[PDB]
Point group: C7
């Protein structure tokens, strides 16, 4: 009998569907325009994508509110349900968002770059790449370590490769009866005859400690980062050979034994 | 007397029940359509299920609000009660949601896969499977370790099997009076005569440390991941045999005893 | 004089009491129906009880709002007071809810079951039962340890009994002058003559380490979980007896003493 | 002149005071009735008191809202001020509420009871009582330790007294030249001649470890909880006496000294 | 021209000032009355002060809302601004509130009192006083330690002075060739001849451990708390003197040296 | 044509600017008056500044709401935007606010003062000043340590300088064959002949431990805080000299060597 | 037919676009004016930028609300969507905001400055610069460490370079038979003959400890920060030379061996 009400309900459903379609199209267009505008301003691609996604989902939320109000759902109900859904999605994506922001910061400020040897909170290796959510490094023995970006930015970043010049330290323990001046001059000759040691830097050769069984000399010399390990090995071998040749003894653990027979 | 009011109450209850039924049916249909649409777009099954569940429960919330408003419950009351119930359910399911998102991320980005040996925050073993809420690994001695996914993604992932080539390290301590060149050449011959050691990689044989009782040589060689342990064992046995044959002594702990009798 | 107002107040109080009674009855009936429906769908009893309790308390909240509005208390006041009470109850029951959800997950996914020996975050023992809020285990020496379920699911679960086959490891230190081939062949004969050692598994007998006073051999063999400890004991005793018979010496801590008398 | 307004203000103040008095009386009566109802249902006294306090304070909040609305204070203002006050009180009482819930759980599920020796997160002692907010234990040396209930339920509970039977473990180190069979048979005779050792339980006597200076035998026997320490002491003394009588030597730390005079 | 509007604005300002004054006076009076009522009910002074401060500030908030509404500021604006200010003050005072509640609990339940020696989470000393926010203790060497109350109640409280009787433990290591019965009887005579040792308590004198160089005897005796240290010192001195007199040797670290000359 | 609307818009903008100016002036005046009132009540300057800033910013918020409502911005929009801005500022200033409150508490209660030597959570030094956000101390070797105030109040405060009298402890290890009475009397004479040791305090000289190589005596004496280190040094030197004079031997690490030649 | 409605919709869209443009322009102008005003008041540039960004985004939010209300979107919907977007952005930028505030505090209060050697929570090095989100330091061996500002301000800051004068400490262990007065006078002569040691500061030379094998003397002297290490090295070398010349012996680890042959 009352055919007007059924027609009104049908036209309301059709209007809601039309609103949904038009709103989705408008959201896509506006989000794409905003993304292109942000990219043209040299803003980072990840940040632009995040902001454009926010814009698109906001416009879609407006469209959903309008359509559901058309089919009789109140604005407060739609807002509450969308808020609950967004809270659930945000709880699911909180860690991913933290890692995403951290990766953006890592790429932007470059505390380390690919190819550099770093120590990221107890693990050390050569950086391979900083991905969207985590950074991959390869250790000296060939292991692959994947570290989330947020964990990296939250802690200390120790970069071994950033400075072109680094320092070697030698701790040489010789017998107490060794001549101090002879040890000093032999070590000084060894480090002066080495061309890869920078002569304009610190060249410390000092007696450092009176140990339990030996007197320890400290040698601190600087070299280019690509020569540090080779310099250490060569200087150590030369120290061994020249101390053996000069009679300077590397002492075994000492022990004064007071003999008492009962 | 006033039979109109009772009939109105009955028809309101019937209308509420009809709204509940129709809303449940519509929620099921729309959730299934959205799930099929997301699956057809190659979106992950778990993500599609989560989003479809959100859509279905949102439509059910709309239906409940409508029906309870029909039976006289105000919209604000329904929103508050549904919010309290959803907050309780979310508190119950927070950890499960975190593990679910972490497992989705693990499957999507594949920091490790089944069959690879990994170290996940202090526990090492072969990955068996990444399940919905946790990952199962079997240790080298046969234990089964179950680790929640969120704990895995929150920490470092060390992958032992990702790189096809890995490095062995040998620390050999010989007596101080040993000839350095003889030790170097014997170790070099041992590592050159081994076919499983990659000759195009690093083949370091250097004197590394002047220890308390011995001078330590470091040997670093690379091999395919499937040959690393066998290479280590064979090279160690050959080092022992050839050092015994050549007279190079592995020294016991040394002690210089200064004898004093009172 | 104005007897109408007092009668109106009395009838409002009576209406509020009737609303309270009817709402309690309806809440009980609907909660029971929902619980039976969820149980008939093979849903877990604990989850069904939790959801039915939520439904019942929501209906009771609706009834309280209606009755208090009848006696003149505003809807916002009732919502705020019920929210404060629910927040207090939720603060009291947060840990219990976490443990309840964790126990449901433990029973559903079964990382361990009753009778299995597990290590749950530093404590090891045989699982007795997973209760509603905590899991009880008995240690090897007879202690009873009660661990909350949330603590269990939040950490690593190491299961000793899940795999039917497990591995034994032997570290045997022999004197440096021992013949490597003789040690290898004696250990190989010992592990081949043992029937409980699985011959289709790994049977590693290798020289593993050049220690301070001894050379260490590693023996890794597999056995059924019920034979692991007995195999370890029998193999160790046989190793001792056969090394004593063959003259292979287990060395005491060594010390090279360089005697110097002043 | 306008005496009507002053009379209206006075009557509003009087009405507010009457509302306050009546609401306090009604809150007390309803809270007491609810408390008696919950007690008659065998519900725990602490839970009943907590819920009755919530009911009473909710009714008092309703009364305050009504009275302050009578004297012209808006409902939103009263709700906001009461919410701020309740938030402050809840911040003050959060830890006490956590301890109260934990104590209720401890009394309800009884992981330990008064008189039992337990280890509660690193501290061990005999439980004296579980109070409303904390549990008191007395250590073996007479100290009194007070532990909050929430800390107890949040961690592992190790109960030493729950099982009627517990296990002793003996690690006996004998000289390498000792006869294995003689040691095994002497230990077996010692543990068989002890009546307090349960013969239907495990009676392990095995060689367990090849130590640096001794070979270690493990003896594991079970006894009633009240006899464990006495059994340990008696068995240890018998082991000492019988090993001395049989010539089995408990070895001092060994040292192979290779004498070299320069 | 329009002098009515200016007069209305002036009278609104005057009305707001009058409301402010009257509300402050009423808040003071009601807060004082509530404080006196709570004190007369034997409620703790600190709790009464806290609750009275809450009441006074709530009444002041009502007065501010009324006055600012008089001068045209909307109720929602006043509520939001007061909420922001209260949130800032609460953030500033959160730790102080926690310490205040903890101090109230400490005074109420008295886990320790002034003059008792306690160990509060790793620091031990004699309690001087429990103040409003922290507790002061003096260590054995005279240091003053101030510990916040919340930190105290959140952790274990070890009370050394609560029990009137405490236990001493002696670990005496004697040579392996010592007669067990003679050692036991000498220690038993020493502890029986001491009057300050409670003879109705445990008087354990047992062989406890077969150490590396000595056999260890455990002596556990009880005494009044004021005699524990003196008993320990006297018993130790008597043990030394009587073991010296009886020939029982306290052994130096032992070493079996196997002499080998190459 | 319609010049009335443009004039209305201009007059609304002018009214908004006038409201902004008048509100800023009123906020400044009222904040200054409140600050002077709080200062005149001897309230701490920092607390008065904080509260006056809150008052001023609240009045400015009221003014902004009024002006933006004048130019057509709704009250809810202004409240939401100001809330977002305040939340951002509060997130930025949370740690600073915590440190500010902690510094106020430190100055008010004075657990330490400038010039006193304290240990603040593992770092020890002389307090220089308590600033607004952090406290500066100078260590014994001249380092400057800056510690945030919140970290200081959250942890234990150990004050070395608060008590005028402190205790020294001496642990003297003598040979086992030393006469106990002679050692006791020599130490007693040393501590009695020292005038800076308080004779009305504890003067403990007891045998404390039977060590591995020596018997340890404990000496505990009290002195004024300014004499503690000098007393320790003088007493130690006197102990050395008098033990050397009396023949009491400070023993070297002992070792019983059981010689066995194979 | 109804061309009025379409024209109205078009004019509403045009009005919304005009509102957007005008609001963006006004936001830029007002934000720039506020930024210039804050800069002219000597306020920090970073704080001014943060506050100006807040002002600009608030005005943009007002403009968006107005325009979307023009095109029919309700104010509550716009507020909710903008709140969700702002919450997401704040979650992304929380750590960056914390680091920004911490860097502002570091620059403002200057606990350390560029060129000073500091220890920031376990890592020590020379400060290079305090950037917007992190601080860069170079270690003594040339490594580069990047530390987030929030981590720096949350922990202790140890400044090695702030004080112009610092203290050296020498622990010299000599043989027990050494003359105490001779050692004291030799050390005193060494430290008096050193010109870089401040004679107006502490010059402690005392016997500090009776060690296991030696008696330890403590020497504490002060010097300018630029001379500390050189003074330490020179004084140590002089101590060695003069003790060798005077016959004072640096003792090897001592051992009293009680010889027993069985
Ligand atoms: C199994 C539950 C329903 C039982 C049958 C209810 C039949 C209708 C009852 C009457 C009633 C609900 C009363 C509160 C119910 C609380 C239920 C709590 C438990 C819910 C699980 C709705 O009654 C309303 O009265 C209208 C009067 O013209 C009339 O239209 C209809 O009867 C109805 O819309 C009156 O409520 C109020 O009616 C107001 C005027 O409309 C209106 O404002 C709201 O509606 C409501 O504030
Ligand atoms: C045991 C408690 C009830 C005692 C009996 C109450 C009988 C009714 C009293 C009168 C009264 C409640 C007053 C506040 C009560 C606060 C109680 C606090 C404690 C609650 C545990 C409700 O009175 C209303 O007045 C109407 C006037 O036409 C009339 O219809 C009814 O009397 C009733 O609906 C008036 O409240 C207001 O009435 C307004 C006009 O309707 C209306 O707005 C609301 O209703 C209410 O803001
Ligand atoms: C010890 C406190 C009460 C003193 C005596 C108050 C007597 C009534 C004063 C008048 C008054 C309260 C004014 C604000 C008071 C703030 C108090 C703050 C401290 C509270 C501890 C209530 O006055 C209302 O005016 C009505 C006018 O017809 C009349 O009915 C009544 O007088 C009353 O309902 C006016 O408030 C407004 O009245 C409006 C018209 O109704 C109405 O909207 C609200 O009611 C209220 O926004």
């Amino acid at each position: 009998a009352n055919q007007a009400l059924l027609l009104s309900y049908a036209v309301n459903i059709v209007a809601a569907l039309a609103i949904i379609i038009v709103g989705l199209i408008i959201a896509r267009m506006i989000s794409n325009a905003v993304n292109r505008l942000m990219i043209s301003r040299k803003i980072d691609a990840t940040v632009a994508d995040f902001l454009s996604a926010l814009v698109r989902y906001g416009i879609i939320a407006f469209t959903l509110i309008a359509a559901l109000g058309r089919v009789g759902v109140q604005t407060a109900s739609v807002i509450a349900v969308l808020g609950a859904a967004g809270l659930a999605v945000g709880l699911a994506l909180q860690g991913s968002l933290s890692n995403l922001a951290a990766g953006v910061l890592l790429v932007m400020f470059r505390p380390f770059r690919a190819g550099e040897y770093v120590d990221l909170g107890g693990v050390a290796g050569t950086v391979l790449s900083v991905q969207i959510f985590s950074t991959t490094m390869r250790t000296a023995d060939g292991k692959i370590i994947v570290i989330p970006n947020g964990k990296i930015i939250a802690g200390n970043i120790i970069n071994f490769s950033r400075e072109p010049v680094r320092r070697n330290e030698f701790i040489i323990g010789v017998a107490y009866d060794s001549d101090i001046d002879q040890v000093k001059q032999i070590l000084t000759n060894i480090i002066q005859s080495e061309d890869r040691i920078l002569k304009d830097r610190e060249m410390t050769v000092r007696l450092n400690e009176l140990g339990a069984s030996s007197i320890n000399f400290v040698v601190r010399v600087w070299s280019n980062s690509g020569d540090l390990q080779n310099v250490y090995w060569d200087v150590l071998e030369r120290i061994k050979r020249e101390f053996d040749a000069a009679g300077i003894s590397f002492p075994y653990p000492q022990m004064d034994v007071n003999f008492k027979r009962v």
